[PDB]
Design a protein around this ligand. Structure first.
Ligand SMILES: O=S(=O)(Oc1cccc(Br)c1)[C@@H]1C[C@@H]2O[C@H]1C(c1ccc(O)cc1)=C2c1ccc(O)cc1
Ligand SMILES: O=S(=O)(Oc1cccc(Br)c1)[C@@H]1C[C@@H]2O[C@H]1C(c1ccc(O)cc1)=C2c1ccc(O)cc1
Lengths: 9, 229, 233, 9
């Protein structure tokens, strides 16, 4: 999900 | 974890430095426009919150899974304490943004919002009457992040929370408070957190209804919402 | 005002003396079970507990100084939080189980017999475990429970009244002093006392959360519980 | 209110 992505970026 | 080794002053400066910016609303209100503005704003704020969270000492030490869980649990509480913080110097008003300062009257055009607006105003007033300092605010907001989902899964988070407690007392002692005043103020501030939790639960309840159309929420807001549904 | 003149030890004595008894369930272990029956049990128990709670509240220092209106509001706000903290307290010495009553000890598996109760059961168990790990003392427990009563509805309430908020805040500060007093007596260092105080108050946020979630599920009943639930709508 | 009553006794 989007949160996963935003947390690594 | 690097967090535990930090001094009180280092903890504070780290927190102050991680602070997210104050965002602007888009350039009377209905029900669709009110929701539109707030939803749009909250959405942009979420992006900054996620990057702020990465900079809360200790947060980066958690698995990605645990990070997702904490943020999913706490995001609305975090928006709320931010809102009440910047609304302090505006008694009777909620400063959602510099160009969007509202009173309880506007809260009415959205069914069920006036009640929560009133709770927010009361919280702001409480913070103001208490003379809450920026350094205390950033500690409280960090506490909300680490605490709110801690039992929804742990020793690391608890040691970090202790460090923040140490930091809060450190800020109060430096502000000249007596021992009795230090513990009383600590309790006063932390009890307010229970009210912020209450406001979030109520608001969330409305939000994952009102997802049931009004405005087409973002996939991100939706996923943040779905986590509570 | 007698509450303000109370010493810490007197505060503790008063709170301990005012403790409600532990009620029995109507649980019949010979009988199967079901969402219907279990919820009948828990509803019947809570209803009887509410009667004792109302009379316990009258003995919480400072509570009777409030207007009848305010007393009503506080109890309407805090009743489930208070049932919950009481539940988690008596469950401390029963890892993995919730001791609703001496004759009704449930595990999460049985919490599945009611749609959506299992998630809340898990939170209650986690809270009980947290209390057990912290070795929460009876004296600390009674302080926490009183704090819930006075705090949960204080921001949910005539200008003049504002002195009503203020009296509550003074009593709350007295209970804080009391908690610190207990910890210092227990041999904790200053740093330890502030840390423990914080840990205990942060748990109250989780108790509010659980109550909110339960209330949501509840209003989705006895005459008193009906009136209490309607309060949250 | 029942609650009000009981509080009044
Ligand atoms: O607690 S609430 O009022 O939740 C509701 C949201 C919508 C309708 C209703 Br009724 C309630 C909440 C708090 C404040 O106002 C509601 C709201 C909001 C948040 C996200 C959305 O997508 C829409 C609105 C608020 C908000 C608070 C602080 C912010 O920095 C930004 C928004
Ligand atoms: O938080 S909940 O599980 O609320 C729910 C209530 C009904 C259905 C569902 Br799902 C949830 C709540 C907590 C505990 O178990 C549920 C419940 C309960 C309370 C009143 C009722 O009339 C029925 C049940 C509990 C309870 C807790 C402590 C007590 O001393 C007595 C009861």
């Amino acid at each position: 999900k989007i949160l996963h992505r935003l947390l690594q970026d | 974890s690097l967090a535990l080794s930090l001094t009180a002053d280092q903890m504070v400066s780290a927190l102050l430095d991680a602070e997210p910016p104050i965002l602007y609303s888009e350039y009377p209100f209905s029900e669709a426009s009110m929701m539109g503005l707030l939803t749009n704003l909250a959405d942009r704020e979420l992006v900054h919150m996620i990057n702020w969270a990465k900079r809360v000492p200790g947060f980066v030490d958690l698995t990605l899974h645990d990070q997702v869980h904490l943020l999913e649990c706490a995001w609305l509480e975090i928006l709320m304490i931010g809102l009440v913080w910047r609304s302090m110097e505006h008694p009777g008003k909620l400063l959602f943004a510099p160009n969007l300062l509202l009173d309880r009257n506007q809260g009415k055009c959205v069914e069920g919002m006036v009640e929560i607006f009133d709770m927010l105003l009361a919280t702001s007033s409480r913070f103001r009457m208490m003379n809450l300092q920026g350094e205390e605010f950033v500690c409280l907001k960090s506490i909300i992040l680490l605490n709110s989902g801690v039992y929804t899964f742990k020793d690391h988070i608890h040691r970090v929370l202790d460090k923040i407690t140490d930091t809060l007392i450190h800020l109060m002692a430096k502000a000249g408070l007596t021992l009795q005043q230090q513990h009383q103020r600590l309790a006063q501030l932390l009890l307010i957190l229970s009210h912020i939790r209450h406001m979030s639960n109520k608001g969330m309840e409305h939000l994952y209804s009102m997802k049931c159309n009004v405005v087409p929420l973002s996939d991100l807001l939706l996923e943040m919402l779905d986590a509570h549904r």
